Amino acid sequence: TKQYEKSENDLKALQSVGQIVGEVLKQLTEEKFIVKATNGPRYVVGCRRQLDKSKLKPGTRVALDMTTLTIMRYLPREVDPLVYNMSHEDPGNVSYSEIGGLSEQIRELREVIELPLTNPELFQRVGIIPPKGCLLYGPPGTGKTLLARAVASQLDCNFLKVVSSSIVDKYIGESARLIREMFNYARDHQPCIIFMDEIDAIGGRRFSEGTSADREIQRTLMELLNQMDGFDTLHRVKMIMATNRPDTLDPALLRPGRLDRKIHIDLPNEQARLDILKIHAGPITKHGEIDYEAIVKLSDGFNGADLRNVCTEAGMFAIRADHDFVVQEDFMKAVRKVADSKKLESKLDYKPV
Amino acid sequence: KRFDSEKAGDREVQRTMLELLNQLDGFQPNTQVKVIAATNRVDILDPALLRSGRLDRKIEFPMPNEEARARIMQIHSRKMNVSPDVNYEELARCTDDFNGAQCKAVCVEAGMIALRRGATELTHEDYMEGILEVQAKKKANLQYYA
Amino acid sequence: SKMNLSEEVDLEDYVARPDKISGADINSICQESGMLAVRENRYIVLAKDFEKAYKTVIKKDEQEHEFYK
Numbered sequence: 001t002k003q004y005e006k007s008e009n010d011l012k013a014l015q016s017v018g019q020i021v022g023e024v025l026k027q028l029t030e031e032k033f034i035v036k037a038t039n040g041p042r043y044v045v046g047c048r049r050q051l052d053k054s055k056l057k058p059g060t061r062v063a064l065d066m067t068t069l070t071i072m073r074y075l076p077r078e079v080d081p082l083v084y085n086m087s088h089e090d091p092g093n094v095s096y097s098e099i100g101g102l103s104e105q106i107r108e109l110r111e112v113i114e115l116p117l118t119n120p121e122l123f124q125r126v127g128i129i130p131p132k133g134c135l136l137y138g139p140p141g142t143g144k145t146l147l148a149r150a151v152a153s154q155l156d157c158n159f160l161k162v163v164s165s166s167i168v169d170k171y172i173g174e175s176a177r178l179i180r181e182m183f184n185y186a187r188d189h190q191p192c193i194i195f196m197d198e199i200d201a202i203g204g205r206r207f208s209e210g211t212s213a214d215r216e217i218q219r220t221l222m223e224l225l226n227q228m229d230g231f232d233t234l235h236r237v238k239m240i241m242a243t244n245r246p247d248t249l250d251p252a253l254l255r256p257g258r259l260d261r262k263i264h265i266d267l268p269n270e271q272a273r274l275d276i277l278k279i280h281a282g283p284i285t286k287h288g289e290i291d292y293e294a295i296v297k298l299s300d301g302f303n304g305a306d307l308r309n310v311c312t313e314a315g316m317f318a319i320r321a322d323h324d325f326v327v328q329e330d331f332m333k334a335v336r337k338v339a340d341s342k343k344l345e346s347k348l349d350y351k352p353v
Numbered sequence: 354k355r356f357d358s359e360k361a362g363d364r365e366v367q368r369t370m371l372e373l374l375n376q377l378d379g380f381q382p383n384t385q386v387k388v389i390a391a392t393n394r395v396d397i398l399d400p401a402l403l404r405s406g407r408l409d410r411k412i413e414f415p416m417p418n419e420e421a422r423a424r425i426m427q428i429h430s431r432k433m434n435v436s437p438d439v440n441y442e443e444l445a446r447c448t449d450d451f452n453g454a455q456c457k458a459v460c461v462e463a464g465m466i467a468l469r470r471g472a473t474e475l476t477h478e479d480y481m482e483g484i485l486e487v488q489a490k491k492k493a494n495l496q497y498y499a
Numbered sequence: 500s501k502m503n504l505s506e507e508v509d510l511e512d513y514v515a516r517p518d519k520i521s522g523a524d525i526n527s528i529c530q531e532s533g534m535l536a537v538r539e540n541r542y543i544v545l546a547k548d549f550e551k552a553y554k555t556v557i558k559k560d561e562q563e564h565e566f567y568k
């Protein structure tokens with residue numbers, strides 16, 4: 001029962017008041033150390049006898065006391081968006097080769113990513129600069145989020161994710177230090193891979209500057225433009241971006257450097273649609289008599305999200321008939337009808353609104 | 354999303370709606386708690402909305418049928434006390450292209466006919482009254498012209 | 500001058516046919532020609548890999564002699 005006495009004595013040590021944290025700036029002398037608290041005041045204070053030479057550091061966060069503001073222990077500094085960035089997930093592996101097309105985009109994205117990791121020798125011996133970035137835009141077909149994130153999730157602890165909602169951040173919020181942090185940790189984990197999706201809102205041009213909120217978009221831009229075209233070495237880390245249209249990217253992003261390789265997604269083709277139907281027919285049960293050319297021919301110019309989810313819509317029409325294994329006749333009904341209904345809903349392609 | 358930028362006043366939400374498409378893309382738990390959406394017009398529609406997680410069933414509701422406009426307005430008028438001898442034949446055919454809200458405009462109008470009102474509705478002309486109120490009535494026709 | 504030569508790639512044609520489609524083809528667009536050299540898969544980048552980046556662009560037309568026309 002002495003564990004209670006042990007537990008309460010540990011809570012007696014909890015009577016010790018907590019301290020405050022700050023960032024070291026410089027040092028005037030041994031008895032005065034410039035430290036900037038997270039609030040922004042800067043103090044020059046002494047120190048106690050329990051610390052070492054590793055406490056000083058070149059501008060690293062420290063914990064200031066609440067009385068004399070002296071430093072107790074030092075800890076590594078992070079603003080910690082990254083743990084939130086690593087909270088993503090995705091199956092595959094397999095989903096790499098499941099899309100089926102285009103075969104040239106399947107093989108190339110495997111090279112520019114994996115080859116610099118395993119074989120740097122080809123770059124240094126031939127004397128060529130490997131691509132440090134890439135651009136995958138849409139939606140002329142699917143595979144943007146599927147193929148890129150598959151290698152991401154398979155690369156495990158080495159990856160960086162960016163959602164377009166985190167750039168605006170909060171009122172009078174600072175995303176300029178996020179752009180510098182995103183590329184700072186990109187230079188830590190190697191090779192790092194960064195995904196930026198739906199940049200049309202956060203890629204704001206400075207031609208027409210609305211209200212007070214367009215400039216803070218330009219600030220996040222110029223922070224991206226500086227480090228991607230640096231002057232700061234990104235050669236080992238790979239970057240990826242995504243957008244609906246490259247209208248607002250400006251000559252800065254449309255240029256090479258910051259955006260290196262722009263690979264346009266291609267819609268599924270009758271030859272390639274035969275492969276994507278094989279992977280769709282796996283999870284769904286079918287009748288013993290099935291023809292893959294029937295579904296491929298009846299559905300043309302449809303994205304992979306259209307084909308899959310309508311093939312599940314065919315299963316929802318199949319459960320309307322309660323049959324477990326269903327012939328493709330009931331499928332071709334639900335596949336053609338529901339898909340042709342989707343075509344009269346959204347205008348594009350080809351006509352803009 | 355319009356065409357050019359910047360900027361739209363709701364652009365913060367038009368990015369969040371596309372973030373919802375990202376939540377329906379990369380986040381598997383978003384397959385739970387189905388969300389229902391409704392719009393007034395499809396004039397502006399995002400092509401990226403196609404998915405099971407994203408907009409899947411999209412229904413075009415046209416102007417209700419003449420028999421449909423009579424059924425929806427009868428369910429609304431079942432509570433009120435109406436004068437007898439309602440054939441339902443003329444009121445259904447007199448309803449053409451009219452929206453369901455304009456049908457309740459006649460239903461809400463049909464609830465005022467009890468007391469006086471004081472204008473004399475009598476009977477069987479009640480439905481065709483507020484039916485013409487929005488798009489009719491001449492007047493002209495001819496005058497000042499041929 | 501930076502690439503090892505060991506040429507294996509024609510330095511003649513690049514001053515003729517791509518020179519007509521040059522401009523632009525500005526600056527780091529030539530780095531993409533070097534960034535398209537990772538397509539190989541070969542001991543030395545093929546002559547078509549540099550030209551593939553120079554032909555696309557994804558620009559013009561057509562144009563010049565057709566404008567005269």
Ligand SMILES: Nc1ncnc2c1ncn2[C@@H]1O[C@H](COP(=O)(O)OP(=O)(O)OP(=O)(O)O)[C@@H](O)[C@H]1O
Pocket residue numbers: 099138139141142143144145146276303304305306308377378379400401402403404
């Ligand atoms: N060929 C496919 N096979 C399996 N699933 C697919 C396929 N294409 C799309 N999907 C599903 O659709 C979702 C979105 O994929 P992706 O980002 O590649 O297309 P998208 O950009 O959403 O297309 P759109 O913009 O036309 O909706 C993914 O979560 C994926 O599960």
